């Protein structure tokens, strides 16, 4: 029972953390694209 609880809680926690960070990484796409553009131009 200990084994199963540990496995399940680890899985759920990892999924929750990734799904929470998904919003933050979506909201900052424009800054990344602009940085890519200005690095591509560069010197």
């Amino acid at each position: 029972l200990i084994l199963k609880w540990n496995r399940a809680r680890k899985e759920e926690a990892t999924l929750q953390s990734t799904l929470l960070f998904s919003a933050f990484k979506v909201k900052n796409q424009k800054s990344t694209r602009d940085e890519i553009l200005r690095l591509s131009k560069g010197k």
Binding site: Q16, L19, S22, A23, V26
Partner: protein, 498 residues
């Protein structure tokens, strides 16, 4: 005659006033830029397009600017490209409704699904999304529940009574028996109902819909039933509107004709799932477990229209799917808030062979009140559930510490609990194909008498095996007596021979 007080009003005649073209594409989601318009576009309106004479409808979701909108398809998207021309009347989708719908099988947007020649259905254009009433106060003139329907199923009739004019839900995982119970309830309710029936398939099997349509034709209740089918092979846009169209048809048959509607929905989880998929395709921030933020509001927008007024009753029987057997799923939590009666199916019970696999220790019903049933029924139900709970507790002690650790009371409690648990199983009429055991219909008083007899301890001598899948207790007594008589005759014959 009948005088409607809040009748449905057909849509307003209009000309195409908004014109545009598709500037972004994706799977199921398309962005439309508006070139010409005599009016500003509204939320949830429909843009129509034609490809090789085939009509494709797109519902508006977001309005970014005065000219740019996002849309999702209602049906198949095959044919849409960049630059496809779209036109709109600034109105939401509508279907043809009339008394001619009974006996016809259609989909949420009104495509004919029962013949190849596509025989048209006459009626007026009504918009299911647009609901019209005098004021908010008018929504609060609803009748109280004052009746209970008889189903013929012992466990449902005794422990989980089903309201008339209310909502009942059948929850369970994959392959536990929701559809079989829904079909049994259809068989036991229709053809005796003073009104009409509406079935709404939402993301279910095509074979099940075909089987149900053929059964409706064969048993003669097809002409009293209206079928709507957005099944699991359809796009998210269609699975999202099946329940709305079914509710609109029920509202037409109640408000405009003063009839009592039996509304069956299966499966009501697919509506939420399709809404979640649409929200995910429009790139909105997910809620917990990756659901849409508007889950509870979306559930309420459909469930609150199933009400009972003085014109008639709308009785809803709905099947709810539990993903991965997780009863803490947000969709299940949202659905729990609307069911007057809740019937929860167990996978372990189904594995043991208990059919129907109803778990009375996890289910509840608000019809178990003095306002609806008698004192004796309440007492019997409470005693039954208490005995089952005590038996479940004692089974762990039996399993771990053996059987001899129990007392004489505990052993008698376990025997009564086992007999009660196996008496609640019953062969369904629709379930004759699976095994061949003929179906049984047990009325409420016979079920109460049998449960009282079992509780009293009168039948502790009969082995538990005899109690499974019978009707009244008289069948158990007859089988026991015949088996004992055969044993006695065989013993007498062998002692005569020796």
């Amino acid at each position: 005659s009948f005088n409607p007080t809040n009748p449905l009003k057909p849509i307003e005649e209009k000309e195409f006033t908004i014109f545009g073209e598709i500037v972004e594409i994706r799977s199921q989601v398309y962005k439309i830029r508006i070139d010409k318009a005599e009016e500003e576009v509204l939320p949830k309106v429909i843009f129509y397009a034609d490809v090789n004479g085939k009509e494709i409808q797109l519902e508006v979701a977001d309005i970014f600017d005065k000219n740019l909108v996002s849309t999702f398809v209602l049906g198949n998207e095959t044919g849409l490209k960049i630059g496809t021309k779209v036109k709109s009347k600034n109105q939401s989708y509508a279907i043809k409704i009339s008394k001619r719908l009974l006996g016809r099988v259609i989909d949420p947007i009104g495509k004919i699904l029962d013949d190849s020649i596509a025989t048209p259905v006459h009626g007026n254009m009504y918009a299911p999304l647009e609901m019209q009433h005098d004021s908010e106060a008018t929504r609060y003139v609803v009748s109280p529940k004052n009746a209970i329907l008889e189903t013929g199923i012992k466990v449902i009739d005794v422990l989980l009574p089903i309201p008339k004019g209310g909502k009942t839900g059948l929850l369970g995982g994959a392959g536990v028996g929701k559809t079989v119970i829904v079909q049994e309830l259809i068989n036991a309710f229709i053809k005796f109902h003073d009104g009409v029936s509406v079935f709404a398939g939402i993301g279910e099997r095509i074979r099940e819909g075909h089987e149900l349509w053929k059964e409706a034709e064969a048993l003669g209740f097809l002409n009293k039933t209206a079928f709507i089918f957005g099944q699991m092979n359809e796009s998210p846009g269609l699975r999202f509107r099946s329940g709305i169209s079914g509710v609109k048809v029920a509202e037409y048959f109640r408000n405009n004709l003063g009839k009592s509607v039996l509304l069956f929905m299966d499966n009501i989880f697919r509506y939420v799932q399709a809404g979640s998929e649409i929200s995910s395709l429009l790139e909105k921030t997910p809620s917990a477990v990756g659901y849409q933020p508007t889950l509870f509001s979306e559930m309420g927008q459909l469930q609150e229209r199933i009400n009972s007024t003085k014109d008639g009753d709308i009785t809803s029987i709905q099947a709810m799917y539990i993903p991965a057997d997780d009863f803490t799923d947000p969709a299940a939590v949202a659905a729990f808030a609307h069911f007057d009666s809740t019937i929860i199916l167990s996978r372990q019970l189904a594995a043991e062979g208990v059919y129907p696999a109803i778990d009375p220790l996890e289910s509840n019903s608000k019809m178990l009140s003095i306002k609806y049933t008698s004192r004796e029924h309440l007492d019997i139900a409470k005693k039954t559930v208490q005995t089952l709970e005590k038996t479940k507790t004692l089974e762990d002690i039996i399993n771990i510490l053996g059987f001899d650790a129990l007392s004489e009371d505990d052993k008698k409690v376990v025997e009564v609990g086992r007999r009660l648990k196996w008496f609640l199983t019953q062969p369904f009429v629709v379930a004759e194909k699976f095994s061949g055991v003929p179906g049984k219909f047990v009325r409420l008083k016979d079920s109460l008498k049998g449960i009282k007899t079992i509780l009293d301890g009168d039948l502790n001598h009969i082995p538990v095996s005899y109690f499974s899948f019978v009707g009244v207790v008289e069948e158990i007594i007859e089988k026991f007596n015949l088996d004992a008589k055969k044993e006695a005759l065989k013993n007498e014959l062998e002692q005569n021979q020796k």
